[PDB]
Design a protein around this ligand. Structure first.
Ligand SMILES: Cc1cc(Nc2nc(N[C@@H](C)c3ncc(F)cn3)ncc2Cl)[nH]n1
Length: 278
């Protein structure tokens, strides 16, 4: 119930659709809060339907580590969310690496873990866990910030079959397009990896996987060699300075065996506990 004429454009925030920063100024004086505004660019009939489910998913979530839904706006459906001022975790970490210690990295880890644990109780599968999709609210709090690929599990099965972010994808997601809580855990493992690399560019999952495959490989061979690599227990390497106990968590998340991957409940308790030993 936001009126389009009351959303005053401040700046673009980034790019299935674009995000803008706007001030909702309903009294048309100069007051009112800044908000984030997501819309589709050239909306095909399939994209609109998916965007409408994204909205209902986001509207259905209330959690300290999940970005807050505010409303919608029709002229061109726009989704209105709270504005989180420190940007993506990926960008915040690059910008402020010098001030972020391992204890802080594990505070973030733990909050992402709690948000995912909560998603799992709603039977939601995120499908796009990555630091680019986590927002920073302040130095002490991060929020899962985008739900554009998120799906609801069917009532009677524990997975769901659908450019993908292939370097964050579990093997069964690459080979069968099967997504589950277990494949979110795989990707979480990649998130934890990103964090302890501090986003040093040549240590990103794409750069590393491309070197391990061979930087000669292009187009469509890439995914085939990645599947092969993962099937042969090829893995992203331990980041410089990542403690043994943390890399062990990553490697456990990256089990080819779906059922042997840990739960977000398990992950949250171990990370919290490692945090205290520090
Ligand atoms: C929904 C929302 C976005 C913000 N804020 C910012 N967003 C962005 N980029 C967008 C594309 C983005 N959206 C979601 C996400 F997970 C990451 N990045 N850059 C800087 C800021 Cl400050 N507050 N609320």
């Amino acid at each position: 119930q936001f009126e389009e004429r009351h959303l005053k454009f401040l700046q673009q925030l980034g790019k299935f659709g674009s995000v803008e920063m706007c001030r909702y100024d309903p009294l048309q004086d100069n007051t009112g809060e800044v908000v984030a505004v997501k819309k589709l660019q050239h909306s095909t009939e399939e994209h609109l339907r998916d965007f409408e489910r994204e909205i209902e998913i986001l509207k259905s979530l209330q959690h300290d580590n999940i970005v807050k839904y505010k409303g919608v706006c029709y002229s061109n459906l726009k989704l209105i969310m709270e504005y989180l001022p420190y940007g993506s975790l990926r960008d915040y970490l690059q910008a402020h690496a010098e001030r972020i210690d391992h204890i802080k990295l594990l505070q973030y880890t733990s909050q992402i873990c709690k948000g995912m644990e909560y998603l799992g109780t709603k039977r939601y599968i995120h499908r796009d866990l990555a630091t680019r999709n986590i927002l920073v609210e302040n130095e002490n709090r991060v929020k899962i910030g985008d739900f554009g690929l998120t799906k609801v599990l069917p009532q009677d099965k524990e997975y769901y079959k659908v450019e993908s972010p292939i370097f964050w994808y579990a093997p069964e997601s690459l080979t069968e397009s099967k997504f589950s809580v277990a494949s979110d855990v795989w990707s979480f493992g990649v998130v934890l990896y990103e964090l302890f690399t501090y986003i040093e560019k040549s240590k990103s999952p794409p750069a590393e996987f491309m070197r391990m495959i061979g930087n000669d490989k292009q187009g469509q061979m890439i995914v085939f060699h990645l599947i092969e690599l993962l099937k042969n227990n090829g893995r992203l390497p331990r980041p410089d300075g990542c403690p043994d106990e943390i890399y062990m968590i990553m490697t456990e998340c990256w089990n080819n065996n779906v059922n042997q991957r840990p739960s977000f409940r398990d992950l949250a308790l171990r990370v919290d506990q490692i945090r205290d030993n520090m």
